[PDB]
Motif scaffolding. Structure first.
Motif, short mmCIF file in Angstrom:
data_model
loop_
_atom_site.label_atom_id
_atom_site.label_comp_id
_atom_site.label_asym_id
_atom_site.label_seq_id
_atom_site.Cartn_x
_atom_site.Cartn_y
_atom_site.Cartn_z
N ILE A 102 0.59 -1.63 0.19
CA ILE A 102 0.39 -0.25 -0.14
C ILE A 102 0.60 1.08 0.02
N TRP A 103 0.48 1.95 -1.12
CA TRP A 103 1.96 3.69 -1.51
C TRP A 103 1.26 4.41 -0.48
N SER A 104 2.27 4.72 0.21
CA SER A 104 1.69 5.49 1.57
C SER A 104 0.85 6.75 0.97
N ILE A 111 -2.53 0.30 -3.68
CA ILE A 111 -1.72 -1.56 -3.57
C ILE A 111 -0.74 -1.17 -4.93
N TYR A 112 0.04 -1.58 -4.99
CA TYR A 112 1.50 -1.36 -6.09
C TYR A 112 1.76 -2.33 -5.84
N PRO A 113 2.53 -2.65 -7.05
CA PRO A 113 3.68 -3.85 -6.89
C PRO A 113 5.45 -3.62 -6.20
N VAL A 126 10.31 -2.37 -2.23
CA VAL A 126 10.86 -1.53 -2.95
C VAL A 126 9.72 -1.65 -4.64
N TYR A 127 9.16 -0.28 -4.54
CA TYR A 127 7.57 -0.33 -6.05
C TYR A 127 8.62 -0.69 -7.38
N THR A 128 8.08 -1.44 -7.71
CA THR A 128 8.78 -2.09 -8.93
C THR A 128 8.15 -1.24 -9.93
N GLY A 129 8.60 -0.29 -10.89
CA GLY A 129 8.68 0.73 -12.27
C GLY A 129 8.69 1.81 -11.58
N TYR A 130 8.84 2.11 -10.42
CA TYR A 130 9.12 3.10 -9.95
C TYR A 130 11.28 3.56 -8.58
N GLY A 131 11.03 2.14 -7.91
CA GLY A 131 11.80 2.55 -7.82
C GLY A 131 12.38 3.02 -6.00
N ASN A 132 10.66 3.61 -5.58
CA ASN A 132 10.00 4.10 -4.26
C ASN A 132 10.83 2.86 -3.01
N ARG A 133 11.28 3.41 -2.29
CA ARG A 133 11.06 1.91 -0.83
C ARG A 133 10.40 2.76 0.07
C1 LIG Z 1 3.98 2.90 -5.45
N1 LIG Z 1 4.76 4.07 -6.07
C2 LIG Z 1 5.84 4.68 -5.52
C3 LIG Z 1 4.27 5.06 -6.55
N2 LIG Z 1 2.93 4.69 -7.19
N3 LIG Z 1 5.43 6.18 -7.25
C4 LIG Z 1 5.08 7.30 -7.79
C5 LIG Z 1 5.67 8.21 -7.65
C6 LIG Z 1 7.48 7.89 -7.36
C7 LIG Z 1 7.82 9.12 -7.56
N4 LIG Z 1 9.47 8.49 -7.44
C8 LIG Z 1 7.81 9.74 -5.92
O1 LIG Z 1 7.62 9.47 -5.32
O2 LIG Z 1 6.71 11.21 -6.75
#
Ligand SMILES: CN(C)C(=N)NCCC[C@H](N)C(=O)O
Length: 64
Positions: free
Chosen positions: A18-20, A25-27, A43-50
């Motif tokens: 679950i993205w904060s 829900i994201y992979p 780490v969200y795949t495709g984004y690189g966020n963690r």
């Molecule tokens: C589930 N995730 C991580 C996303 N849907 N990310 C989209 C935004 C990514 C950008 N680096 C940010 O964090 O602003």
């Protein structure tokens, strides 16, 4: 209902989280697990966020 709260994970496993920011829900793949915090960083795949998620909150990954 949320029956999948019997989740046990290992690092390097694919999951969904679950993205904060959007609450959706994201992979994501597990980067680290801290069993003491009962949480893990994904780490969200495709984004690189963690971000850190709860092991029990982690959902089954995508079909990819
Ligand atoms: C589930 N995730 C991580 C996303 N849907 N990310 C989209 C935004 C990514 C950008 N680096 C940010 O964090 O602003």
């Amino acid at each position: 209902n949320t029956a999948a709260s019997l989740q046990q994970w290992k690092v390097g496993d694919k999951c969904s989280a679950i993205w904060s920011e959007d609450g959706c829900i994201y992979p994501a793949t597990i980067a680290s697990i801290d069993f003491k915090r009962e949480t893990c960083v994904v780490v969200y795949t495709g984004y690189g966020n963690r971000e850190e998620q709860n092991l029990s909150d982690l959902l089954s990954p995508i079909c990819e």
